[PDB]
Symmetry: C3
Subunit: 184 residues, 3 copies
């Protein structure tokens, strides 16, 4: 299989692969055009995001700066909002539900390395997809790690570092994040 096929499937892959490199340059190009848009260019922003992302709802809004790796692995639901200076390393799929509110400086990662140093120095990496449900609030400066599923109506406290699955209707905070409050 190609490096891109391995990447998308969650297997070890070489990022220096020519096809993957070109796709990263294309994401970076669209992100650069996005980050240069004036604060009143709403339609132009919407247009750029729908071209960047794999799929969207009717509307979405993101404050510059924004960063991502590929673009096409990000799928967001209706009425998506992400505040200033976010980063989504979408080596694998990032799938987000409807009515997501994401605060500023939020980082969502699918990209990872082997823990063993010889395995890591091979220069092979992989990814684990991230799934975020409907009606999720992600507090500012939270970090969502690869492989994490967040249930519907979950609240992520600001600054929380989420290393495991978050149950639906739960509030999590801390590092590593733990359930603090059950909503019902």
């Amino acid at each position: 299989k190609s490096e891109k096929e391995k990447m998308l499937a969650g297997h070890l892959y070489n990022p220096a692969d020519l096809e993957l490199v070109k796709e990263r340059e294309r994401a970076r190009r669209l992100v650069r055009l996005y980050n240069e848009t004036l604060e009143t260019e709403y339609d132009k922003r919407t247009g750029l995001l729908k071209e960047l992302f794999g799929s969207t709802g009717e509307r979405l809004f993101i404050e510059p700066n924004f960063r991502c790796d590929y673009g096409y692995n990000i799928h967001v639901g209706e009425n998506f909002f992400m505040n200033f200076d976010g980063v989504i390393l979408d080596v694998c799929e990032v799938r987000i539900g409807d009515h997501c509110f994401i605060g500023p400086g939020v980082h969502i990662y699918t990209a990872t390395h082997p823990l063993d140093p010889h395995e890591r120095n091979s220069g092979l990496e992989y990814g684990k997809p991230v799934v975020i449900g409907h009606n999720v609030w992600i507090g500012g400066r939270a970090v969502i790690n690869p492989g994490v599923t967040i249930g519907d109506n979950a609240v992520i406290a600001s600054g929380a570092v989420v290393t495991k699955d978050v149950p639906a209707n739960a509030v999590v905070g801390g590092n590593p994040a733990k359930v603090i409050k059950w909503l019902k």
Copy 2:
């Protein structure tokens, strides 16, 4: 009450309100002009901030990038310094005393959402002000949450997530931050 009056009073309000939208655009405009200034343009930087913020002392300096929501809700004391890549969501007042040193990547939030998903989905938000005393050091990458007061001479360790009031002369650290020692 206008939506702006409800916002400033800590009441639920609609950020889509036309007046608030214009005010947010005007703030992003000034922030855009600021973030584009050269590293040598000290006087232009000062004037931009004194127009952006509600009040200042004689001298202040902020390393780009900087981000805020309204600008006019930010009040800083003498010799204010904020290092690279700060965010202040100033839906309500953010009042900071004299001789503050704020490290890079620091986020201060006054904006918040209802916890209930349906109430949150209404689009209505609210805020709680943040008050920071004199001679405070906020270490790099700290998060200061809505409604928090930080006493005079307090130190916020780098990376601390501050969820509750910080006593004067206390050092706090962790997520959630706790008092780790006392000063002076």
Copy 3:
């Protein structure tokens, strides 16, 4: 002893020193040029980094935006990689070995203030060097504090706030970070 000599030696120094302000301006100029480079301008980026940093290996790559204080205090080994939106406050030396992987939003600090409220209000600062071994993975959004040394083959979990030395072959995580796993 000039303010620069005291800065480098780890003593109290005044950052407003004219020589230091010039050096800080020079660094920001080079950083501004770097951050404006296109995603396809690999050779331009390499040249700029090799001009900005104190020493490098043959190959290195950093995703904009990047921030630093002086540049010349940063020394990186072979195949250095740093992802989006990193900050390195290099008031004192930051020495990093070969094959380092640094995630996005990583902050490495050498700059610090007196904790004592009287001393800090002098406005004088100091620094403590940071040393990072070979084959280290620093997870995105990690914070590395002044005077910390990280041993060879160590892994810093995403979001970890590192306040003390990390042993070779350890995985650390949390805030303050602690050893969570041993590799060797």
